[PDB]
Design an enzyme around this catalytic site. Sequence first.
Site, PDB file in Angstrom:
ATOM      1  N   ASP A   1      -2.035   5.640  -4.945  1.00  0.00           N
ATOM      2  CA  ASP A   1      -2.237   4.776  -3.758  1.00  0.00           C
ATOM      3  C   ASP A   1      -2.769   3.218  -4.170  1.00  0.00           C
ATOM      4  OD1 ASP A   1      -3.162   3.785  -1.652  1.00  0.00           O
ATOM      5  OD2 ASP A   1      -4.724   5.157  -1.204  1.00  0.00           O
TER       6      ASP A   1
ATOM      7  N   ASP B   1       0.860  -1.371  -0.108  1.00  0.00           N
ATOM      8  CA  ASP B   1       0.024   0.096  -0.127  1.00  0.00           C
ATOM      9  C   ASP B   1       0.825   1.302  -0.001  1.00  0.00           C
ATOM     10  OD1 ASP B   1      -2.204   1.251   2.608  1.00  0.00           O
ATOM     11  OD2 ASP B   1      -2.039   1.684   0.584  1.00  0.00           O
TER      12      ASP B   1
END
Length: 323
Positions: A213, A33
Amino acid sequence: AASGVATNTPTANDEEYITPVTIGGTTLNLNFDTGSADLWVFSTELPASQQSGHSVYNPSATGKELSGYTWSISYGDGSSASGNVFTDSVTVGGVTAHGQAVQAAQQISAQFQQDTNNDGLLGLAFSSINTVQPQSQTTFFDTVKSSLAQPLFAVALKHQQPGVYDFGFIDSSKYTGSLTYTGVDNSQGFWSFNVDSYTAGSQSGDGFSGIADTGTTLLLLDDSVVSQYYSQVSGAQQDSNAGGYVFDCSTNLPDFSVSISGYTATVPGSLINYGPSGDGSTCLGGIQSNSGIGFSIFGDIFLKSQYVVFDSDGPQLGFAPQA
Ligand SMILES: COC(=O)[C@H](Cc1ccccc1)OP(=O)(O)[C@H](CC(C)C)NC(=O)[C@H](C)NC(=O)[C@H](C)NC(=O)OCc1ccccc1
Ligand SMILES: *[C@H]1O[C@H](CO)[C@@H](O)[C@H](O)[C@@H]1O
Ligand SMILES: *[C@@H]1OC[C@H](O)[C@H](O)[C@H]1O
């Protein structure tokens, strides 16, 4: 100088991408992430019923405890996790970080309890937003950065096919043409950048800022942009059962592009069809609202179209169309 390649694989409908990570000898499937800076894993400190169906880390076997240290994280979708901290050896695509802080989960919210596809998260945002207390820790990338050939990582996320995380080098065979770079604002700990303009099918508008992201499934934009997009999709309607705007799966969706320092990054309309809404017979759109937060989340829908380079020098982000 080190470098490595880690292969990622999408789960159903490309909801998340998981990659193997070896911690103290045990391999776990983690979600990488770029929107967070904590490396947390399911552990033997969770209730046994919550360990079920996951690979768990056992801190006792190999970790060195940081007495008195805790972590607690809250994400954008409302999920949360907390626990304690150990240092151990973490290997990703053959690059080993020794003494990497590993955040062992003691509590996890329902979202995490329901997902048996991942065993935790490996954060790749800037270390400034690591949640460890009383002293924050460094991300796997910051820990190894100085040993890498170049202090960067690159990602190719794909639609229903394995992709890669390249650490310390750029694989030119993964994109077409040359990369275009843009400056990164890391003041809130994200890989944040600016777009100069956007085109939603037949409509164009002014720019905004957003973060790259990998931990967010969709492309989250201002409500104004979302409206403008779906106004061009025949019969599109909001369905709270599905999670946002839905439409008939056979619909022709317009493309979406952004202009980034001269380069037009285009997400083709076929990639904006996320998949079955699971609410009857419609499909969920890959573009949804960002809930009024003030900046856009360039999640997996967007990333599936690009090869992206996260360079700590600048910092800056490079983009090119995936090959
Ligand atoms: C503090 O910053 C973060 O939390 C960062 C940045 C962020 C800030 C603000 C809003 C959104 C994102 O999120 P992140 O770390 O990427 C964080 C990691 C996950 C693993 C909890 N993702 C999120 O919070 C986002 C909104 N969550 C998601 O995209 C979840 C995993 N997926 C998901 O919602 O799929 C969409 C879907 C809807 C309906 C039916 C099927 C699928
Ligand atoms: C990544 O780059 C390193 C340093 O050049 C190589 O040794 C490694 O084999 C991989 O190509
Ligand atoms: C995952 O790991 C290394 C290689 O790049 C391969 O492509 C893959 O399956």
